[PDB]
């Protein structure tokens, strides 16, 4: 039933604003936390409990923490329109940033702020009765997101143990880039994701920019558009816990179906009816059309081409007016295609979900209103190509000890670079070996 | 002669809701539970499925089991949900995770004692107990693991009674779950030792029935579960109404099962016909027999034309002649003689019941024991060996605690079942 | 940017309450509330 969200740094807080805006409008909580209880047609329901708790006077408050080292972005959340929704203790801010240094976040500064965050997370987990996971939002390109993300994940593993932690992570795009030191921070985050995370979904802004230019008609997109798309994806995946449906799917079923071996937990994500209002009324949007859409690489939210690999498992979430017979006919047609290939040890490659609640429309949004949508998360060997380009860029800079002074002076041994680079190299070899056909049988 | 029902998992609870609607409708029980019927013939056998509560009411002898109460709240919220006794809903606090080992070993052992206590309390109240009836899917998590656990416990406590299961099995074309081969193989391994009679239904076969025969524009799970509830309520009709040739679950088992391992059967129901066509053809015994043997009307993906019938049973409902039943079963056996196993002189048992389902003049339900069931097991065993050779998802099951030897034993036992069917397929008189 | 993007639609939502979508989530019923109310009340079990 309940889930707790952890937002880290700038990308995580800005994506959090869009997510909580959507969850409020979907459940019906007003921006001040109240509800017009007297103007109602249906009946009051407990569905909010997954994301909200009531004080008893009827105000709603959300199960989230916002973590940042600079005050400005959290102060922007504190002074905006949703000021009264959040409890002030949940908005935690430090004094100074990690300055794009993973070492500064992990060793020197995050160690001071981390104990307040752990005390707040404990206070949330004590007010729960069926917690089934943590959702974490962060970018691995920046200093505090990487370093404090890694430390918090390490502490959570020891404290909560087996409890699941699902991460949505903005990884450095393959040619669009924002800072020079991105490779070091992304590499040194390898251990945290590899050993302390159950499923990690990777996103690149260059793919969401391509999707918003090609499908939507936006010439000058900004981060609020990307964050609205991410919020829609999260709402689709969590709808299975909150609303009625034909085939429900609990968050443990994703972990059971998508990960064959404990390190192979990185998945690609895509969304089908990204369409503008003027095009939406000129076209039907049947189940088979959106099912065909989710497999085209123009629909993906990560810059990778799955045609360079093999699928191991796919999980398809349908929401809205869909009939199971059409889903079965669509999946059988996809299975017929010759450009889609599965590893021969995975014969039953699909998991299906069908929910009755159609996707919500946000007043200032750019998506059209549609009766049905499908969202897919899939595990594929093509992801090995994404790590190799970061490793090449890391190998280029570390050779000349280009910026090592900052990290070693701020507290890190030079050995840690070689350690992290060899561990990610072994992960690439794992992805090469697991994907090799067992053609030798006798 | 009363049956106790157990419904497990989402599929089981959903099929059960439609079954109890059909049973309550035929005996005239209001959705509040009040008897509102119009003939004593309805009341005289009400005991078979209902217990009597005070001042008119009847309550259904069923146990509902699930690991999260969400489904229980959905079934309690349905249109006939009120009839169920509140104390009969048993639920835990965490899910099966779509994992057989969790459903059998961790949450299974946590809940099973309360279920065995309720099942024994319900069974020992009966004056004479007939078999148990269980509905579940083998591809799921709590249905397969805890259903087979409960079957094992009830077989220990009541070894002289009958154990009957209706089970849903994965389609050959599209999977609903990635780990279906493990759950199916372990469940079939448990059933072949424990069960007395097992009936199998493919959702793909119900879709083909709806689209080809009924030409429905927008089918839903309510239609598939209504077809299943119709056949389920048809099999027991001779137990609870008069007839010229009464029948019973034990008589069906004795005539259908030649050897104890060969107890997996195909199902069909005959008077299926579209609303546009129905005005053009009247019901008669030749029409029911022709649809009844048409493979288009069979609820499994395997086709009889690739196998041979060892035995079959037909239960007829309605006011009808013995000539049409006896002469039709002889004529069908004589014209298609190559499809019947030759070392049994007569493979079909017939039974006739006077009271048809409401709105139909006549109906027949068909149960068939056919060797083509070997193709389903062979397909599941191939997909299992491909996944097991590569340790595809084994760490979940081993982390719950299972020894790898269980997988090799279950594979070997299922492979021997396939071999036994193939050997009886190619037997000869010599 | 956050003002013109999010605060504008927040103010619009404050002015208009007919934009909230209707829904049906009948899976939240009495047994779920019974499990909710009974946290920490485990009694009379044998180990």
């Amino acid at each position: 039933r309940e889930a707790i969200c952890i937002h880290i740094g700038q990308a995580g807080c800005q994506v959090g604003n869009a997510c909580w805006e959507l969850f409020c409008l979907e459940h019906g909580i007003q921006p001040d936390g109240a509800m017009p209880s007297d103007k109602t047609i249906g009946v009051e329901d407990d569905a909010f409990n997954t994301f909200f708790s009531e004080t008893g006077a009827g105000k709603h408050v959300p199960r989230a923490v916002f973590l940042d080292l600079e005050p400005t972005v959290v102060d922007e959340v504190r002074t905006g329109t949703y000021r009264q929704l959040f409890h002030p203790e949940q908005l935690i801010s430090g004094k100074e940033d990690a300055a794009n240094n993973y070492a500064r976040g992990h060793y020197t500064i995050g160690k001071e702020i981390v104990d307040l965050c752990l005390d707040r997370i404990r206070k949330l987990a004590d007010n729960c009765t069926g917690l089934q996971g943590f959702l974490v939002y962060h970018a691995v390109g920046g200093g505090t997101g990487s370093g404090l993300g890694a430390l918090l994940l390490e502490r959570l593993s020891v404290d909560y143990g087996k409890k699941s932690k699902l991460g949505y992570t903005v990884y450095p795009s393959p040619q669009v880039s924002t800072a020079v030191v991105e490779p070091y921070n992304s590499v040194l985050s390898t251990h945290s994701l590899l050993e302390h995370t159950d499923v990690a979904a990777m996103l690149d802004n260059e793919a969401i920019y391509d999707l918003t230019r090609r499908n939507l008609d936006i010439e000058r997109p900004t981060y609020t558009n990307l964050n609205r798309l991410i919020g829609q994806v999260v709402s689709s995946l969590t709808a299975s816990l909150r609303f009625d449906g034909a085939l429900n799917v609990d968050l443990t079923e994703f972990q059971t179906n998508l990960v064959p071996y404990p390190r192979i937990h990185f998945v690609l994500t895509s969304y089908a009816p990204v369409i503008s209002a003027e095009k939406a009324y000129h076209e039907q949007l049947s189940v088979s059309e959106i099912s065909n859409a989710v497999f085209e690489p123009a629909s993906m939210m990560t810059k990778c081409d799955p045609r360079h690999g093999k699928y191991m498992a796919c999980c398809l979430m349908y929401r809205g007016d869909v009939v199971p017979k059409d889903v079965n006919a669509a999946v059988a047609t996809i299975k017929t295609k010759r450009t889609i290939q599965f590893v021969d040890w995975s014969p039953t490659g699909f998991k299906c979900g069908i929910n009755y609640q159609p996707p919500t429309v946000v007043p200032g949004g750019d998506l059209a209103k549609v009766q049905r949508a499908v969202c897919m998360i899939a595990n594929s060997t093509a992801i090995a190509e994404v790590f190799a380009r970061i490793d090449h860029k890391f190998d280029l800079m570390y050779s000349k000890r280009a910026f090592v002074h900052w990290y070693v002076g701020e507290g890190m041994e030079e050995g840690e670079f070689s350690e992290a680079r060899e561990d990610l190299a072994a992960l690439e070899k794992d992805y090469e070996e697991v994907g090799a056909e067992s053609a030798d049988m006798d | 002669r009363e049956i106790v029902c157990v419904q497990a998992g989402q599929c089981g609870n959903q099929i059960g809701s439609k079954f109890w609607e059909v049973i309550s409708d035929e005996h005239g029980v209001d959705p509040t539970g009040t008897y509102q019927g119009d003939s004593d013939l309805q009341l005289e056998r009400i005991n078979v499925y209902f217990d009597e509560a005070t001042g008119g009411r009847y309550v259904p002898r069923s146990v509902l089991i699930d690991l999260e109460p969400g489904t229980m709240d959905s079934v309690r919220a349905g249109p006939y949900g009120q009839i169920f006794r509140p104390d009969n809903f048993i639920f835990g606090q965490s899910g099966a995770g779509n994992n057989w080992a969790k459903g059998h070993y961790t949450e299974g052992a946590e809940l099973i004692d309360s279920v065995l206590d309720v099942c024994c309390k319900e069974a020992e109240s009966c004056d004479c107990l007939q078999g148990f009836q269980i509905c579940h899917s083998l591809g799921g998590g709590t249905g397969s693991g805890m259903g087979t656990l409960l079957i094992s416990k009830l077989r220990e406590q009541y070894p002289d009674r009958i154990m009957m299961t209706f089970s849903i099995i994965p389609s050959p074309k599209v999977s609903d779950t990635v780990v279906e081969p493990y759950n199916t193989t372990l469940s079939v391994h448990q059933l072949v030792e424990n069960s007395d009679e097992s009936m199998c239904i493919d959702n793909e076969a119900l879709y083909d029935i709806c689209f080809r025969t009924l030409k429905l524009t927008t089918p839903t799970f309510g239609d598939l579960n209504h077809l299943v509830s119709a056949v389920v309520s048809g099999v027991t009709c001779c137990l609870r109404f008069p007839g010229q040739l009464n029948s019973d679950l034990r008589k069906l088992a004795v005539n259908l099962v030649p050897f104890p391992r060969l107890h997996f059967f195909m199902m069909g129901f005959a008077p299926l016909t579209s609303r546009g066509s129905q005005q053009y053809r009247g019901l008669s015994v030749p029409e029911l027999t022709q649809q009844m043997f048409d493979a288009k009307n069979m609820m499994q993906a395997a086709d009889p034309r690739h196998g041979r019938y060892l035995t079959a049973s037909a239960l007829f409902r309605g006011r009808m002649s013995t000539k049409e039943v006896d002469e039709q079963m002889l004529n069908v056996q004589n014209k298609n003689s190559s499809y019947f196993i030759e070392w049994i002189p007569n493979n079909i048992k017939s039974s006739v019941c006077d009271i048809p389902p409401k709105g139909l003049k006549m109906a027949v339900t068909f149960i068939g024991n056919n060797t083509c069931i070997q193709e389903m097991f062979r397909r599941v065993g191939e997909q299992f060996t491909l996944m097991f050779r590569r340790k595809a998802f084994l760490h979940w099951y081993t982390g719950e605690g299972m020894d790898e030897m269980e997988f090799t034993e279950a594979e070997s036992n299922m492979n021997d079942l396939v071999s036994e069917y193939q050997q009886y397929q190619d037997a000869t008189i010599e | 940017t956050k003002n013109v993007t999010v605060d504008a639609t927040g103010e619009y939502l404050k002015d208009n309450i007919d934009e909230y979508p209707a829904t049906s989530s009948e899976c939240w019923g009495m047994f779920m509330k019974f499990t909710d109310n009974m946290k920490g009340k485990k009694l009379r079990e044998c180990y």
Binding site: - | - | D18, Y20, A22
Partner: peptide, 23 residues
């Protein structure tokens, strides 16, 4: 809305598109 046997039936899937919770 027609049953597989031809009889009329009530709705079984909620109608939500185009609906609003608060009047």
């Amino acid at each position: 809305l027609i049953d597989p046997f031809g009889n009329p039936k009530v709705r079984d899937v909620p109608d939500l598109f185009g609906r609003s919770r608060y009047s």
